Amino acid sequence: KETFYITTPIYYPSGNLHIGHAYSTVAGDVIARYKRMQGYDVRYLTGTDEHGQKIQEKAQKAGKTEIEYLDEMIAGIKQLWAKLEISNDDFIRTTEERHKHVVEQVFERLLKQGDIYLGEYEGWYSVPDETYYTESQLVDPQKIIGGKSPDSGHEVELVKEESYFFNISKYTDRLLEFYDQNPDFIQPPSRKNEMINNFIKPGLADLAVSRTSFNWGVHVPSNPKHVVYVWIDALVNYISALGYLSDDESLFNKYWPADIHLMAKEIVRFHSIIWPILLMALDLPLPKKVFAHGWIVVDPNILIDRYGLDATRYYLMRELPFGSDGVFTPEAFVERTNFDLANDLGNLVNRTISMVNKYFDGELPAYQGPLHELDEEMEAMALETVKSYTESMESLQFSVALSTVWKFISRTNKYIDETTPWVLAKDDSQKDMLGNVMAHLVENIRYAAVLLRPFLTHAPKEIFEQLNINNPQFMEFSSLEQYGVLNESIMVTGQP
């Protein structure tokens, strides 16, 4: 089996996770489930970025130690993934020693190679903007001992502390030719707009990779006064969870390099500039793709509690496109759950099964062929639906994949209206044509169910149970390659 490795970013537990975090984890889960269905040996990683000044600050506010606050927050994050039915194979926490030993050995290796050197970082910080400015780009400076931010117009404070600096500009030629060798590394194309003002050409200044002003993080083994900064600490999660530099590297050598790093748009530079340069410094292969989504603070728990899991999972992947910034409104939420799920899919299933009970006492007649004049094109549309779905799924166009699936679901409801099986049922001469129509209904529903398995966990399962499709062979993608899979009669369920 071919392998597939997909990661979410490790999330910062400075507060409760909102639907943006739910989007990212469900998106990665859909791709994980999708790839398992295609036959890949899938690993899906997610986790938490638990180091930094903010976490230390937040723990004292809880009236608790850092690890006890963190454990409490991580429990609720983990509980949310259980509720969302996320099929992640591991949960990496940066406070775990399996991570910290990797960050330590990585940092010490960069010291021994001469990649990092001791110095001091003197930067101007804005409390509002959360951005580091330089002496010359301050507005109305008062040699220079204060000033005002060019973005906010708010006064800045002198941030001055000891730091290790990473010489990243020497890997510039290798980075630029990696981009030339992988033109579509950043996906979708629009997320390359976050690469504007990269300063790879004019000169990447040495990157500050450790701080001295706080003690909550991975300590540098040869100079424990320093804590390793988020840049290297957080990014190492993708390789540390695989047991890189441990006594067992089997997961790493099986799953690295990563196929997709999934993320939100504001950390693309993180993953496309700093992360590959760090990997070159460690002489490791680079990730094949970064996939970045947009923005949408709503608690996902309320959405799952009130309307159910499928409703939440569907709405997130349907309404909020990956290549754009989606919008949460509760009006669109109720409409997506009522009109698409409950009506289009749900009435279809009820209509179809009700007629199979009414006319054949549950005995669904075997698929013979396209007997009705509308079947030839509908079967072709079924194959095209799978083909278009695939195109969208390979580009993480989840919104577009789901609408295509609903295109087919609407047409199936349309087919009932234009075949009018109740008219066929009256005439005994039309028994074969009625069974053909019933058969096409059920096969169309199966196509939709299989295609929806990555997105929804409950609904497709119950459709298979209602139609009495027990065979795991009838639930996989490969069974959608040729229409008309049920050539032997089936007993559908009596009371759905």
Side-chain angles (χ1 to χ4, degrees), residues 3-52 54-55 58-111 113-126 128-129 131-134 137-143 145-153 155-158 160-200 202-305 307-357 359-360 362 364-375 377-430 432-472 474-481 483-487 489-494 496:
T3 50
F4 193 85
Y5 182 42
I6 188 259
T7 67
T8 76
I10 56 163
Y11 304 125
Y12 205 80
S14 51
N16 293 320
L17 272 53
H18 52 64
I19 55 156
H21 302 108
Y23 181 90
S24 311
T25 310
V26 172
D29 186 59
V30 169
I31 294 304
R33 290 172 182 282
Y34 172 76
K35 290 282 160 203
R36 291 191 192 98
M37 287 177 67
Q38 287 188 331
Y40 288 76
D41 188 336
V42 178
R43 193 149 188 92
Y44 177 33
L45 183 68
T46 189
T48 45
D49 183 0
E50 300 185 20
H51 295 152
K54 191 78 137 281
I55 296 298
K58 281 257 60 191
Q60 325 209 39
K61 273 57 214 144
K64 233 142 176 164
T65 61
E66 287 106 328
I67 212 76
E68 288 281 354
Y69 165 82
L70 282 163
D71 282 11
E72 196 163 292
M73 292 295 309
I74 269 68
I77 307 225
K78 252 167 197 199
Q79 280 166 25
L80 183 59
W81 302 157
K83 291 173 81 200
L84 282 158
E85 293 191 21
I86 307 305
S87 62
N88 59 302
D89 296 275
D90 191 23
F91 190 102
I92 191 67
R93 299 179 67 185
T94 57
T95 48
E96 291 168 337
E97 303 207 323
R98 71 188 168 122
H99 178 77
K100 294 195 290 180
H101 129 88
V102 179
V103 176
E104 283 166 6
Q105 295 319 120
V106 163
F107 205 91
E108 292 296 306
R109 170 157 173 205
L110 273 36
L111 262 174
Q113 291 174 175
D115 293 294
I116 65 178
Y117 59 85
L118 183 59
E120 193 187 58
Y121 178 68
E122 37 182 39
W124 294 101
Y125 185 74
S126 299
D129 297 291
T131 320
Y132 285 110
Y133 302 94
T134 262
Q137 85 198 175
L138 293 182
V139 176
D140 296 304
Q142 344 92 357
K143 172 179 74 178
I145 68 206
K148 147 156 65 87
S149 172
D151 297 7
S152 65
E155 294 187 63
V156 293
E157 267 175 13
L158 174 59
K160 218 212 284 268
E161 53 176 301
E162 324 202 339
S163 186
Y164 281 104
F165 288 98
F166 184 17
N167 179 213
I168 58 171
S169 68
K170 71 180 179 283
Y171 302 104
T172 291
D173 294 327
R174 291 166 77 176
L175 188 76
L176 288 190
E177 89 184 66
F178 166 69
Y179 295 152
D180 295 342
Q181 284 160 20
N182 284 82
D184 300 305
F185 166 65
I186 303 166
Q187 301 279 42
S190 59
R191 304 302 171 198
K192 298 185 199 173
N193 300 350
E194 249 92 15
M195 293 290 288
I196 298 287
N197 311 143
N198 58 52
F199 302 144
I200 299 160
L204 296 167
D206 295 343
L207 185 76
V209 290
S210 67
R211 297 297 142 104
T212 230
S213 56
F214 66 97
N215 82 137
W216 188 250
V218 179
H219 294 271
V220 178
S222 50
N223 207 2
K225 203 193 306 310
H226 293 242
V227 160
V228 178
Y229 191 54
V230 59
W231 285 124
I232 135 167
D233 186 13
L235 288 172
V236 159
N237 96 92
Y238 301 132
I239 64 174
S240 76
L242 301 174
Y244 169 66
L245 302 178
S246 80
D247 296 319
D248 177 30
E249 282 180 323
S250 48
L251 296 179
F252 181 76
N253 291 300
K254 183 163 172 193
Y255 294 108
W256 196 256
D259 291 277
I260 293 170
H261 285 307
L262 188 145
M263 62 203 75
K265 68 195 180 172
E266 77 281 1
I267 65 179
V268 169
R269 294 157 80 80
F270 228 118
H271 293 79
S272 62
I273 302 168
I274 304 308
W275 178 225
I277 287 170
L278 187 66
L279 292 157
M280 286 171 186
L282 300 169
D283 192 25
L284 304 176
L286 304 181
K288 299 168 212 180
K289 263 133 184 61
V290 309
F291 269 87
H293 65 74
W295 305 330
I296 303 162
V297 283
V298 179
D299 192 359
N301 286 292
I302 297 161
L303 296 173
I304 303 161
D305 289 6
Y307 311 96
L309 174 54
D310 285 2
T312 304
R313 284 179 69 106
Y314 178 66
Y315 174 81
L316 289 170
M317 305 318 297
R318 176 67 189 91
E319 193 68 9
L320 317 171
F322 197 93
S324 181
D325 294 31
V327 52
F328 180 80
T329 179
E331 292 88 64
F333 193 99
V334 295
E335 293 169 26
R336 286 291 177 196
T337 59
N338 289 141
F339 308 165
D340 299 11
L341 300 171
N343 288 338
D344 260 288
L345 183 46
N347 297 334
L348 170 54
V349 171
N350 295 355
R351 285 168 89 183
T352 296
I353 296 172
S354 187
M355 288 183 287
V356 175
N357 289 300
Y359 309 133
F360 299 104
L364 182 67
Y367 175 89
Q368 297 201 57
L371 280 64
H372 203 281
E373 72 206 357
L374 299 168
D375 297 344
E377 279 195 339
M378 193 168 71
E379 292 183 8
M381 192 200 170
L383 299 185
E384 275 283 296
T385 295
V386 172
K387 188 254 174 182
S388 179
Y389 169 98
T390 308
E391 288 179 352
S392 305
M393 290 292 282
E394 296 298 319
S395 313
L396 282 65
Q397 294 219 266
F398 300 106
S399 198
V400 181
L402 287 175
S403 70
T404 304
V405 170
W406 253 262
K407 220 127 287 184
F408 192 63
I409 293 160
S410 306
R411 200 263 166 284
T412 304
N413 270 304
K414 239 36 233 130
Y415 177 82
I416 291 165
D417 302 328
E418 69 202 1
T419 57
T420 61
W422 54 87
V423 174
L424 297 176
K426 290 158 199 153
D427 188 7
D428 293 274
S429 185
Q430 310 275 40
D432 293 326
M433 190 59 68
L434 180 64
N436 173 80
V437 168
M438 291 312 93
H440 276 84
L441 257 30
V442 174
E443 182 71 345
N444 280 30
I445 293 159
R446 196 187 64 81
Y447 267 71
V450 169
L451 293 184
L452 291 165
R453 287 180 65 211
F455 293 87
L456 319 175
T457 59
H458 300 132
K461 190 204 177 212
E462 188 57 39
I463 292 159
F464 295 131
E465 283 166 6
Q466 280 175 129
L467 278 30
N468 198 181
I469 295 160
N470 280 217
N471 198 352
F474 301 150
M475 297 178 186
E476 305 306 326
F477 285 134
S478 60
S479 72
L480 309 187
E481 284 174 314
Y483 192 101
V485 120
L486 298 166
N487 356 268
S489 293
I490 254 61
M491 191 73 75
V492 306
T493 196

